[PDB]
From Swiss-Prot, chains A, B:
Its cofactor is pyridoxal 5'-phosphate. It is found in: Cytoplasm; Cell inner membrane. The keyword Protease does not apply. Transmembrane segments: none annotated. One of its GO terms (biological process) is biosynthetic process. It holds the Pfam family Aminotran_1_2. It comes from Sphingobacterium multivorum. Homodimer. Pyridoxal 5'-phosphate binds at G112, F113, H212, T240, S242. Catalyzes the condensation of L-serine with palmitoyl-CoA (hexadecanoyl-CoA) to produce 3-oxosphinganine. Exhibits a broad substrate specificity concerning the chain length and the degree of unsaturation of acyl-CoA. This is Serine palmitoyltransferase. It catalyses: L-serine + hexadecanoyl-CoA + H(+) = 3-oxosphinganine + CO2 + CoA. GO terms for molecular function: 8-amino-7-oxononanoate synthase activity; pyridoxal phosphate binding; serine C-palmitoyltransferase activity.
């Protein structure tokens, strides 16, 4: 029955208003492979809104690995890893990821989102505490909500606030600090040295979500702990397969005893179907390529350095990025929507960040680099971004 | 840091004890396609522990559709549907599913698990109520936890308890009842006529999770509402792609205004990468086959009726199944583990159900049928199940 339900959703008018004004640019239907140029409405559009940082979703070798796994293993495992859904290739990928991030063991999940829900839901219990950076990914907030522990947020990369909040807690409780490694909105990196120093002083567990770090920072792309040399001081490395690794799924890597506990207690692995064979094989081959062909991470960083320098030359106001995410401040929700749609209609795809996710005065567009971008594509996008910011009067 | 973390997991000894006794049968590593016979350790094993009810993960046409989508679209969309992750084929699948279950609109999720988290997390808020059957899937419990509403459980298929609990609630609040359609443990069907009668009397929203119903009950497999003719009285039909539909992902289907609210407010669709092209195409082709080739649902039911009658003839104690899930009571955790591993070593895969998921006296094995099973395979499994129950003394 719909009376009260109709009421609950009656106040949500922003999509109706964006569509009526001709500004709506969510769920844009792409007709081609994810690539530096995509087809939308039969038109070619430059993609600067992706998370495919190394451009590997189009690699013929990765496509072939996925097609070969469909031929051997079929379209799906039809159950949880716990029961009838484990393949020899799931276990191969866990071993390969464990070796990559320098940990004893790993457990896969069918999504990155589910990879955060697992450990955050089941390690800390009644009378325990989870400490979250206030800018942590939604999956981390939600995982922590699913725990039976007390969740405390600390100020973004604020080590005094983290120290103070931990200082207030009973000695006779378990603590877990969970942080993004690279934070996707502004593209900044966690202060892992000071966070891990604090963790060690309070005997708190440390988990890092490397969604945006894998294939980007660290030796051969191995992530945020690898970037700082702090493998030893991080208990759990979480990552996802949907960004650099060009696939779908995620993992948590850690000590064999912790991972064994997780794989038998995390509801998001016990009660959800396992990764498709095609996604296991695509992740396996992508991981091989990232490690063996250093040119991908190199070209991503050459594109990042070039685009950041060109943006600052043209006088764009950038956020404090340390990554291939270039946040360009606009500071008006209305202008952010207008700029996004005008760039779309001029053949440039960027991602808006608006209220209520951020204050209006901190609204921005995110311009993300891939290794496969050319300096010419970057120049064409920045040209068009100069023209639209002028027409919009920023 | 690991001190307190080491303590939190120190008491979890059941896996260490199962492995040491040679009884462990979780995460069994399959070396072949999910099929009526699988390869484990180079040995052939009969699969009666699957959710591939129509046996479609091996259909050459579905494999080919998935391989063709990899060729055209690559290995992954590399972002949320909300931003850069929507393909023309996502929208095609939403339209096809909406038509199938007789609803205005649908939104996909990258997992079934995530398809429950979306609506349950974001429709009911502060001062609202979610009513859950006590045997609801873990994904439904967790989705409801992620809401800011008051979650109330009612006795399993207990319509007096549901009526009473709803009667106690303020008139001036929104209510949502969420139920499995087929409940996977005992294989029983929700009393949808009485639940929807109660919902209509209290103006409560109704959501049904058709994970185990799609491709099983309803006209051409269209699910639990279709089974009862109650399309009109169910607000939201949720399903998954990982069972009959031989893939990975899920959906929620409903009125256009509700679905539009969900696709812009559900954290599990806004903040998680979209389904792989290979999984969209495999789901599309599987859905076409289920509707066009009625023989699959027919043979599933012929196998279900044959196996249930053979089991009852041999005097097995079955649960109150109305589905291709045949729950066989053992009523001892120790005997349940022993029976499961002895059947595994004799070439028969079944799924155990033990404490703490159920009371020891209600421990059982689940024996699940696929359309592709033969009467000879069924006879061989039941033969072996007679022998092992004898050796175990049940
Ligand atoms: C009733 C319902 N609802 C939702 C889901 C989640 O779907 P997903 O697996 O993510 O595609 C399951 C998964 N059920 C499985 C995986 C098999 O029954 C389990 O072991 O619990 C389920 O049984
Ligand atoms: C930091 C972190 N952690 C976990 C995830 C979940 O991974 P999954 O997408 O399920 O593979 C995301 C997804 N992030 C995306 C999808 C792209 O940034 C987003 O729009 O929020 C993420 O940014």
């Amino acid at each position: 029955s719909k009376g009260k339900l109709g009421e609950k959703i009656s106040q949500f008018k922003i999509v109706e208003e964006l569509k009526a004004k001709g500004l709506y640019a969510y769920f844009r239907p792409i007709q081609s492979k994810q690539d530096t140029e995509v087809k939308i409405d039969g038109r070619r559009v430059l993609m600067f809104g992706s998370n495919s940082y190394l451009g590997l979703t189009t690699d013929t070798r990765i496509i072939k690995a996925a097609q070969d796994a469909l031929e051997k293993y079929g379209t799906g495992c039809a159950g949880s890893r716990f029961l009838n859904g484990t393949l020899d290739i799931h276990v191969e990928l866990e071993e390969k990821l464990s070796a990559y991030v320098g940990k004893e063991a790993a457990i896969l999940f069918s999504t990155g989102f589910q990879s955060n829900l697992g450990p955050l839901s089941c390690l800390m219990g009644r009378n325990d505490y989870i400490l979250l950076d206030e800018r942590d990914h939604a999956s981390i907030i939600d995982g922590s909500r699913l725990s039976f522990s007390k969740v405390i947020k600390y100020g973004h990369n604020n080590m005094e606030d983290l120290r103070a909040k931990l200082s207030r807690l009973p000695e006779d409780s378990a603590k877990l600090i969970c942080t993004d490694g690279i934070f996707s909105m502004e593209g900044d990196i966690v202060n892992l040295p000071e966070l891990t120093s604090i963790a060690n002083e309070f005997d708190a567990a440390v988990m890092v979500d490397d969604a945006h770090s894998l294939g980007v920072i660290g030796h051969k792309g191995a992530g945020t702990a690898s970037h700082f040399g702090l493998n030893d001081d991080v208990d759990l490395i979480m990552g996802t397969f949907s960004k650099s690794l060009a696939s779908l799924g995620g993992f948590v890597a850690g000590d064999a005893d912790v991972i064994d506990f997780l794989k038998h207690n995390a509801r998001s692995v016990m009660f959800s179907a396992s990764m498709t064979p095609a996604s296991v094989a695509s992740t396996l081959k992508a991981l091989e390529i990232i490690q063996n062909e250093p040119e991908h991470i190199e070209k991503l960083w050459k594109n990042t350095d070039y685009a950041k320098a060109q943006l600052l030359d043209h006088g764009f106001d950038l956020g404090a990025t340390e990554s291939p995410i270039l946040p360009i401040f606009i500071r008006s929700n209305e202008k952010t929507f207008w700029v996004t749609k005008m760039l779309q209609d001029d053949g440039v795809f960027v991602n808006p960040v608006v209220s209520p996710a951020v204050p209006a005065e901190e609204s921005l567009i995110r311009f993300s680099l891939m290794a496969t971008h050319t300096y010419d594509q970057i120049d064409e996008a920045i040209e068009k971004m100069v023209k639209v910011f002028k027409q919009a009067e920023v």
